[PDB]
């Protein structure tokens with residue numbers, strides 16, 4: 001009757017010296033807040049007319 | 051009346067520069083909003099996958 005000793009189920013990250021890698025993915029902060037123009041979009045367009 | 055075509059072509063070039071600037075501004079706005087939406091969706095998908 002053979003003994004069940006050679007069965008070693010391996011894990012993924014049991015105790016790898018506690019790496020604790022801080023990713024901190026700042027993907028939401030990568031937005032393009034574009035500045036406006038030099039005006040003449042609503043003031044000059046309404047003041048000039050025809 | 052010899053100075054009329056000069057001002058005519060000057061105004062035509064000005065209008066061309068203006069419409070090209072408007073097209074470039076619209077294209078930049080399109081690229082900006084598309085990049086924002088794509089980055090948001092990619093971040094959501096990556097968070098769900100993780």
Ligand SMILES: *[C@@H]1O[C@H](CO)[C@@H](O)[C@H](O)[C@H]1NC(C)=O
Nearest residue numbers: 005006007008009010011014
């Ligand atoms: C399984 O193997 C690991 C390293 O390879 C060892 O630390 C562990 O004690 C083993 N477990 C058994 C039940 O043999």
